[model samples]
Target: AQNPNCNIMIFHPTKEEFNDFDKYIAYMESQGAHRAGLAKIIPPKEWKARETYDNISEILIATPLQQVASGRAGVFTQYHKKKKAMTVGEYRHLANSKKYQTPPHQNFEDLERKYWKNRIYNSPIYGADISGSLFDENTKQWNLGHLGTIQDLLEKECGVVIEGVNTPYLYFGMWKTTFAWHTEDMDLYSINYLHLGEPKTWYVVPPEHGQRLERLARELFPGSSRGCGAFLRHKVALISPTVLKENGIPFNRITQEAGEFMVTFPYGYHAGFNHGFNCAEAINFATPRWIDYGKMASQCSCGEARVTFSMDAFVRILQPERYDLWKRGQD
Candidate 1:
């Protein structure tokens, strides 16, 4: 109660775009999405217990000792500690080994319905991100959020095409699958909508505590964020909520279910695990409020003094001529 808290908004399931598969594909196609990826993650604690965590492989999806390399973005990863992410061929061999409880190939037929296990999830090459070919790109440069629904509103009302502020990455997850601690690019706002399946749990810290957590992260690990042109040089430490609470970092937990929407505001550091199999869509967005953080995040993460959107470029180049375009949309 004394600590800071934020929430994952669970909106009503009335949004038809998320309920029907065909409509969603249609929605994504209309959005003109381009950048997309998928990933599976394991908890550090669980990982430590499974395989030998002493090796660098424990810290990354490294090539296995038997010369097993992390291959193909779409390859599935097991929950085994120090598990290897390999080419689809190697994964077949690994899955058959009695060394782990990997799922059999038979279960894959469910990809039609979707699923996961203890050590579940495929790499981006095999991820569940919506195909970009489904939609037409509104602006080659600016997309307020990749969800075309938002884009439709901004364009229709403002007569403007804002590109790439809060683009989303779609996800299909199974048990213990995770996304480590991170904020929306440039600490902007993100909207995560779960279409179906088991619930996803989230841990969130408000923007006020954002800097505090960053400083705390540095103090605890020292090596954190020491990267070249990087905010954190090493991988994010799997900081649990208990750890955050004990250290006086206020946080909130939200269990995201089917037909619900979870929102993270600018600079909110969030992490979560999927309870079971599920599909969720997410994207980033910006407005007048996002400009400052966008600039700051760029200077910090990209070695540039300006944000990815480049505030200077916005004023001098695009918006001057295009501002009225967005304005005219209201008509």
Candidate 2:
């Protein structure tokens, strides 16, 4: 996924494609894509080898440290002071206090910690517990609120038939003034849309340079911190799909907007910045789910955790007949 809110590619299929939806679906499936739900599609092949040395170098060298400092400071000054130690009740009380600002600066550390903790303790077999003001009141309904509204409008206006069903709930939020350095996670099919503000700076690193860039992030940031991960420089006007194609980077362009082109990066590295703009927010969705096990295991594993189940494990716990779908999909 590339960055800069405006860079999001708006998928605009022709009328003929929509007229024969089943044929289009078959074509997509033939191209190794699956129907996630409704109109959303998921491509199967992973694009891991997309990180480039130039992209990584730019993230390490050009990113401004003030972005992190300001973002953390803002979170500390606002949301941290409002909440009591634990419990949503206390957080809600602080929210209703009227003393703190609405849309308060969120603490990224707290958010990340809460997400992992909930994933271990409260996760359903398929989902993680990471609440946001934007999700629907019914947890099962993952509505993107104003963004969803905009998407709906676009579909209606353009007759595009954009689908949001079965989309995974993902977020890209910055506290205070922090912004992500250019980097991408491992999701074969993903869509990242900017929800607010102008397009921010983002950089795309090709996969060939992943090792060197990862090393740089380790040396510079050290101690495993969230934003401390590797990033790339942000170039607003350049279209990533064109750039990748020019460089012979193996990726499928998912969208065409300058700031929002989707890349099927099996393992791409990219990052972004806010350019010290007020703040930033984004919505990210992916198919087959993007599980950050390194992050998860770092939080969940204790002692020497071993896996008893292998590729050929039996369905002793669940009904034997349901095993195929469960094994192939969410289980």
Candidate 3:
């Protein structure tokens, strides 16, 4: 049978499974723990939520750990390190402001632009520090540390392969909001699970219908970067089960209580937003492989000018050296 547009496959671990945390850790170690990695200790059944949240937080706070395949997380750090010199307090403050305050239309692009601009320019005390730190005297390329353990862990544990270079996972902290739109590159797939508070709404549009919708959204929104195109795979949004059941077009109603779910698809056009005051988090996984050369083409220039510059730059930095190996075999 054809897979459902989106399948909510829930697997509740038995007591024996819950007790295998050490084994999982060992398994990861066997796979070369040198790369940044994480092994979460599952909590009691009653405390699953707390356990999941803690693990996610652990992954978030442990900067030394290499996130998914994208180094954008490190790039974010590099950008802020010199530009903002922000302390944990400052970072938390800025994150809080963006989380609590609602942007003009609750649109994703507006919010990201405003926040990133502030991150790059404002915060006089910290911005200069960040800018200065990113400039390398020798390589002319920024050094955000090599992909450490986490990348290894993700590959070994989650079956995700970093196509070219190790890219850090994009972590959207709990309660924070991401702009509404489809992914720009077909190389990446996003995974989100609730840790605390109420579950947010996730809406997805399949690739088959994405192109038409993207054109319509762009024409209607104008300067807005939100929308999906033909090459887009699926669109995902976060909403209440009620809203999801009713308005979750092209997606079937699958109840997700506390367990995590993976949303995997290339060229799928998806968008997500916060549904309530609850805290939520998501990690976006991206590969360096280029699939198409359309509006959201993967060429360096095309991506840098329109898509996220830092991420595109990261892909370029690693593509030449790793592309052949990646295509030849899986790690």
Candidate 4:
């Protein structure tokens, strides 16, 4: 059902998309995701993303992908529960491996100090980088479901990398690892598809409140990077929800279920924490309108563009058709 008042909408795929294999593309394309905060969004049975997702296990099979495939890797986070950044890569070796509570000797603030040497302790794994190695060159499945979206088509058209489109990556998180507050890069739309495992709780601000939050954030952080403000993780100067509510800003909270799809629109400000062990894949894409905003965000583009990334470059063989799906809805 759709929530007209709340920005978050929970929807089940239609019978046509569910029953017919061929219609899966149209189903995904139909929900423009101007359909904000779409959640518990189960995909059609013919979801091409799922078919390609299986390819990951196959590719990791014979190879000693001992890293990501290994069942014992330590879980880490960007800081929640007011804890400092700690990368205990081999936490499995610890006696209190299961319970992540603070030690008796150290206070919460003291324990969070270990990773204070830098910005924050971080150990990240970006699964998209392994594309060349993870899937065989002959494999026909998608690394993701960009088949009907601009991200899918841009890569096909561009001979070179097209910035955000080239950066598809997977996130593995446990309780407290957060995505911090901000809109999708350059206010473009993005999709996060849960591959398997535990769920993530998301807090979202619709475009209107998103703008208000940004304005207040600017006052709080003058001469700062754009839209910078509190992360609300409690550790990040965690503001009480009541404070925002008192000021008339609304937040939509939802726990994304396993196998569900979540979409974030152009101006939504979102942040979230995972409940337990989980793995998910996410990628960003721009509609035709991203061209203008792209000018504002792309300036911060640092680092070398990849030889693999092929960047300005179909940068789509299929974009027009998928883009038209939105227009048809409009008409």
Candidate 5:
């Protein structure tokens, strides 16, 4: 099922390259890696074997399974419930029990689709702080606290690290669970790490094609686009690669397995689903390049219902003494 032409760029970085986010991303993007919107990084294997998890307070995602599984137009705006809570330990037990497996003497595709469309399974837990996480060893170079990254600079300016922005998030995934296509808040860069479990499938649209993707989405879901200013912010719809290609949108597809990282560039739209049970952690950051993108985000007047990061406040903090000078430079 792999299409070599559709594969996103992949990087195998050394310990030093992986440790420095600025240097790594700059070098890669300079080589035109960001043209794919997302890239997969296979980190040094030594860092992988040691990090593992235990019982975590499970935050569940309750979906109107039929809508997404059935491929409905308003799937992105569906009123799905979350906070289907439990502990990670208990989730493992339930999955291992095979209660959710396909019944015997049945059509695999039909049964599986029906099962996911009808069942409520564990979903991604967003914005989880790293205080007591399984990755406590803090050996990973991508840690929110790691110095010299843009988030680190943001933290120093803001006098705090904002969870989900400067801080990391943990995601729990079960088979067929979906994350709809969307850009990071304020068009910032984001990274996701698959700690364990089955591989995840991702589809991304490069920044260059983001506006075209939005126009196509609006055409596909006109009513939703009219009702909700930023329709994609709802994070419920899944458009297949075929549909995207048919509409002349360039979509890159890739699979991220355990012990790998997925980096999403500013304004890059990405969405995907899990193959099976898995856990991943993600967070958002900004680069110097993000400054222009941030300015562009500030001028956009949609997704009013959605909460947005304040680029104005961010700029003020970054340049308290030279605030006017910075604003003038942008003008």
Candidate 6:
């Protein structure tokens, strides 16, 4: 049986509107784009490719020091922080093989029912923060640092660069590689630009139902929730959309193909899995309006070891006129 999911708003702006990133985003938000929690933006057909390189191996070798989180396929475990020192070539090789093997003597009925059905023994790499390493700065349109829409208040006013928050991160995903449900750090906005790739299936809950999703997640992972209220932010939990529909939660599913942009609004809850080999770049961004959300975010203290950077110092440095200008722009 098919699950119920909401239809996300798709915006196809002209070159003029698309060039002025911030204004278009504001316009979209004014049109209730945020209500859906996530939206898709398709660039003009004449857009340029971000990277000139064609080989993933060459890119990995170029940035040899950079590490990525590798996760086992079909294993619903805490694979968010499992970083391994494997080459991209090796990973691709593993992805092609048919050897389905689980850790010896560790099989459980739940694992067989939930995770091992696919029986794919491959390591899908996720969360590779390549803010400035992989892509060129010249690609100003989607470049996180250059996106005027985000204005990235933390970096502009605070003078501190938080990787993955303000800096663009790269993801190398294969079949069934998943990203768990979660909101952006500090409740900031995020844009994921697919440089080149197979379609990625994204499932997003409306902002109004964010609590419903949270409550369901807490119930599903009681141990994790007991340990920390902000456990979902760790990006290790994956709940199927069918289950969400069964629980009467509304969701929207969208296919992000090559050269499309996916924008996640503040406090928007989203999760999805990749269909095949694909490369995507994503980063968190914030405008003046995000300050209040940042203030509401619970930083540190939770079991989540990687907490978002504090915006307190930046808030103090914020000038009235600067805020006034941003407020005026809102009109």
Candidate of highest TM-score? 6
Better of 1 and 5 by lDDT: 5
lDDT of 6 by residue, 25-101 (tens): 88877777877889999887766645564666634512322112223332243454355555566555544455422
Off by over 4 Å in 3: 4-164, 170-176, 222-259, 275-331
Better of 2 and 4 by lDDT: 4
Ranking by TM-score: 6, 5, 4, 1, 3, 2
Candidate 2, 1-331: lDDT as tens digits: 2221212222334544534433543454444332211122222223111222122111111112221121121111101111112232332233234432123225533433332222222101101112232333342211233222322433444354443332233222222222232332212223343323223333444433444444543443333324322222220111233334454433322211112323323234444322111111133333222223111111111111121232112221113354454345323
What lDDT is obtained when candidate 1 is compared to the true structure?
Answer: 0.43
Q: What is the lDDT of residue 99 in candidate 4?
A: 43
Residue 20 CA error for candidate 2 (Å)? 10
When 3 and 6 are scored with TM-score, the better candidate is 6
TM-scores, one per candidate: 0.50, 0.31, 0.40, 0.55, 0.73, 0.74
Local error of candidate 3 at residue 29 (angstroms): 28
Name the candidate, 2 or 3, with the larger lDDT value. 3
Regions more than 4 Å wrong, model 1 = 1-168, 228-235, 298-331
Q: Candidate 4 lDDT, tens digit per residue, 266-296?
A: 6667766554445576766655444444433
- Give residue 223's lDDT in candidate 3 (0 to 100): 31
Candidate 5 Cα deviation (angstroms), residue 159: 14
Model 2 ranges off by over 4 Å: 1-176, 181-189, 222-264, 275-331
What is the TM-score of candidate 4? 0.55
Which scores greater on TM-score, model 2 or model 3? 3
User: How high is the CA lDDT of each candidate model?
Assistant: 0.43, 0.28, 0.33, 0.43, 0.62, 0.63
**Model 3 TM-score on a 0 to 1 scale:** 0.40
lDDT per residue as tens, model 1, 249-309 = 7666656666455656666677766655455666665444445555455223233222334
